[PDB]
Amino acid sequence: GPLGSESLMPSQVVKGGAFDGTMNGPFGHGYGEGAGEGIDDVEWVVGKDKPTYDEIFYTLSPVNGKITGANAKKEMVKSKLPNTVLGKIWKLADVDKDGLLDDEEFALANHLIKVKLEGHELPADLPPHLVPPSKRRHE
Ligand SMILES: [Ca+2]
């Protein structure tokens, strides 16, 4: 034991003038966690970058308020991808899978394009905080 040999504590701490009487046996720990409930805040990150995708939208020349998927495919093709990433970008951006993309569907299309550009591919998941207004629905 501690007689005939000095029993040193694993961490040698010096409590100068502090006679410590830690009552052992109770165990617990809880900090003030910031609880975020469903406050009425519905704003997908595209509402603030749509102007970019929408300007390119009219820049590629849309028809009847949406781009023919042809030009949308051009856009995501020049985004420098194989048909693998490209195909799943299309099917992850176009919720209806029309063969076209409206101003918001380009918004998503190009948004996921810059998401893959972040250095990570798309996970084939479509979150309710990234679904264009027309498709605000979890089914
Ligand atoms: Ca669509």
Side-chain angles (χ1 to χ4, degrees), residues 17-100:
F19 38 93
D20 192 282
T22 300
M23 298 177 300
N24 291 270
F27 188 71
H29 193 92
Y31 56 83
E33 55 185 299
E37 55 181 271
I39 54 192
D40 287 272
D41 281 275
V42 53
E43 179 180 71
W44 165 27
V45 189
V46 149
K48 43 202 62 185
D49 196 30
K50 189 181 185 292
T52 309
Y53 318 128
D54 182 93
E55 68 104 317
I56 305 168
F57 172 73
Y58 289 88
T59 287
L60 295 184
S61 183
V63 175
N64 303 157
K66 71 297 273 66
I67 47 191
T68 49
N71 76 79
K73 298 306 286 296
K74 315 314 285 306
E75 214 25 72
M76 45 174 63
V77 153
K78 68 187 71 161
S79 298
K80 300 189 181 302
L81 303 164
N83 281 204
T84 324
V85 185
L86 181 75
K88 70 168 178 173
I89 288 189
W90 179 259
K91 67 183 78 284
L92 201 68
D94 190 3
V95 187
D96 337 87
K97 307 179 189 180
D98 311 273
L100 55 81

